[PDB]
Amino acid sequence: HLQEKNWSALLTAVVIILTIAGNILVIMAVSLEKKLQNATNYFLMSLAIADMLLGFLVMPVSMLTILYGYRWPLPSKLCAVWIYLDVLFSTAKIWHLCAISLDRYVAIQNPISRTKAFLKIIAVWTISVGISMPIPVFGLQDDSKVFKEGSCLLADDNFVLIGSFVSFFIPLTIMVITYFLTIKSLQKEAADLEDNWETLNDNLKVIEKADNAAQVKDALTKMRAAALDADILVGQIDDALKLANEGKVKEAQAAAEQLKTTINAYIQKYGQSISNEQKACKVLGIVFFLFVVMWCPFFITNIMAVICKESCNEDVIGALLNVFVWIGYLNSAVNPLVYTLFNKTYRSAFSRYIQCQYKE
Numbered sequence: 323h324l325q326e327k328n329w330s331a332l333l334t335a336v337v338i339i340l341t342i343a344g345n346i347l348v349i350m351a352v353s354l355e356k357k358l359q360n361a362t363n364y365f366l367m368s369l370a371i372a373d374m375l376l377g378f379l380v381m382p383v384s385m386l387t388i389l390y391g392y393r394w395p396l397p398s399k400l401c402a403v404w405i406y407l408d409v410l411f412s413t414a415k416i417w418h419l420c421a422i423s424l425d426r427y428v429a430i431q432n433p434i435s436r437t438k439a440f441l442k443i444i445a446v447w448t449i450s451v452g453i454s455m456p457i458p459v460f461g462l463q464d465d466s467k468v469f470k471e472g473s474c475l476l477a478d479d480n481f482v483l484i485g486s487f488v489s490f491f492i493p494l495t496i497m498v499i500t501y502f503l504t505i506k507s508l509q510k511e512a513a514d515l516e517d518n519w520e521t522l523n524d525n526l527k528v529i530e531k532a533d534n535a536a537q538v539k540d541a542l543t544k545m546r547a548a549a550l551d552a553d554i555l556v557g558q559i560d561d562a563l564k565l566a567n568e569g570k571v572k573e574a575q576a577a578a579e580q581l582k583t584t585i586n587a588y589i590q591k592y593g594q595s596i597s598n599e600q601k602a603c604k605v606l607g608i609v610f611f612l613f614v615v616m617w618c619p620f621f622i623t624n625i626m627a628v629i630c631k632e633s634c635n636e637d638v639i640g641a642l643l644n645v646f647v648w649i650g651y652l653n654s655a656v657n658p659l660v661y662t663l664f665n666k667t668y669r670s671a672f673s674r675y676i677q678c679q680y681k682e
């Protein structure tokens with residue numbers, strides 16, 4: 323049933339090549355660059371493996387169906403295995419994004435490891451293997467579940483409805499909530515730090531203008547409390563407090579000037595740590611946004627088709643969905659570009675590997 327009228331097959335092969343190339347560069351950058359050895363970038367590498375296996379195993383079979391007028395050319399029991407691999411890789415992807423969002427949030431609230439990251443990644447893959455499992459279990463026993471007019475697709479309306487809910491809308495919702503609370507957490511952490519900075523800076527000025535021990539002691543006690551809210555400084559403040567208690571006003575004032583170097587060092591370090599987390603959250607927010615928006619047409623159209631079953635042209639719906647599948651496959655090529663545009667470490671690593679300089 324081969325059709326030679328397929329300029330679409332040129333555009334799909336581009337999407338396969340951008341997907342495989344981009345994701346190998348992500349996989350090599352997390353493998354080789356120490357500056358990317360962290361839990362977030364381990365999940366982004368697992369995401370890249372899911373994208374790479376879509377480009378090798380799922381996307382070329384999808385191109386093969388376009389060439390034969392969406393008439394399944396492979397043996398008939400490979401249809402349910404193809405859909406299984408297709409739904410598993412993308413389900414693993416949305417639970418990866420949702421695992422990154424939740425991990426970052428929990429990491430702020432619990433301020434206190436490769437193995438912990440690999441436990442979570444492996445848990446996300448097992449969760450996606452088990453939830454996607456009804457597709458081959460029922461679809462290999464009943465062709466009517468994975469075939470409509472000799473097209474291979476998920477043909478049971480109930481798998482599409484229940485599947486979209488448990489594998490798209492629920493983890494999207496968890497992703498959206500945990501991302502929003504992460505942005506509020508980080509704004510509050512930046513805000514509490516600035517408040518602590520004002521209290522420390524103002525008290526240092528009081529100690530500087532002090533003529534009496536009581537003023538220095540009151541200011542240093544207030545400084546100690548602020549330091550606890552944000553240690554090495556707390557001990558240094560206690561030494562300055564001891565001088566003030568024994569009436570050594572001048573000596574305590576000098577010790578307070580010594581505190582300034584410790585205060586400035588910590589403030590700048592914790593303050594540039596928080597703006598690193600905020601920038602990281604923004605890039606993840608582009609990844610998150612582009613994964614949902616690119617898959618939204620396919621899911622919403624497919625839910626509209628179930629709702630207006632009798633009333634709507636299923637031939638036009640099936641044509642649009644075929645297009646909409648490829649907007650979703652194009653997302654497999656976007657994550658590496660996003661990292662090039664907004665992460666210098668990824669841009670630098672990609673630049674060397676393309677030049678085949680694999681040495682650190």
Ligand SMILES: CN1CCN2c3c(cccc31)[C@@H]1CN(CCCC(=O)c3ccc(F)cc3)CC[C@@H]12
Pocket residue numbers: 405408409410412413415416474475476477489490617640643644647650
């Ligand atoms: C008309 N028609 C075209 C062919 N196509 C098709 C399917 C079902 C019904 C109708 C179909 C199949 C779906 N496949 C994409 C699955 C996306 C997914 O599982 C997922 C999970 C979680 C996510 F967060 C985001 C995406 C593309 C290939 C098949």
Ligand SMILES: CC(C)CCC[C@@H](C)[C@H]1CC[C@H]2[C@@H]3CC=C4C[C@@H](O)CC[C@]4(C)[C@H]3CC[C@]12C
Pocket residue numbers: 352353354359364365367368371375440443447
């Ligand atoms: C079952 C198939 C489909 C996917 C299974 C996922 C496995 C193979 C993947 C997902 C995430 C991956 C890890 C992600 C991070 C790192 C650290 C890096 O410096 C070297 C590779 C290493 C150690 C990877 C090893 C393999 C890994 C655990």
Ligand SMILES: CC(C)CCC[C@@H](C)[C@H]1CC[C@H]2[C@@H]3CC=C4C[C@@H](O)CC[C@]4(C)[C@H]3CC[C@]12C
Pocket residue numbers: 618619622623626633634635638639642
């Ligand atoms: C929400 C955004 C991001 C994209 C989603 C697009 C969805 C909601 C819209 C866009 C165009 C729409 C289609 C336009 C016209 C027709 C022809 C009619 O006989 C059957 C329904 C059908 C096929 C519509 C179904 C819903 C549809 C697919």
Ligand SMILES: CCCCCCCC/C=C\CCCCCCCC(=O)OC[C@H](O)CO
Pocket residue numbers: 428432438441442444445448
């Ligand atoms: C095939 C075998 C694997 C499948 C089953 C594996 C399940 C492991 C789940 C979690 C590990 C991570 C927990 C350890 C990390 C400590 C930090 C912490 O507080 O995490 C708790 C949670 O993230 C906030 O509620």
Ligand SMILES: CCCCCCCC/C=C\CCCCCCCC(=O)OC[C@H](O)CO
Pocket residue numbers: 409453454455456457460476480481482484485486488489490
């Ligand atoms: C005796 C045989 C009866 C067989 C059962 C018939 C009725 C059960 C309905 C749904 C099953 C579970 C579906 C949810 C999980 C599988 C689908 C999935 O993961 O999602 C697909 C994808 O997300 C969508 O585009």
Ligand SMILES: [Mg+2]
Pocket residue numbers: 520521524
């Ligand atoms: Mg003030």
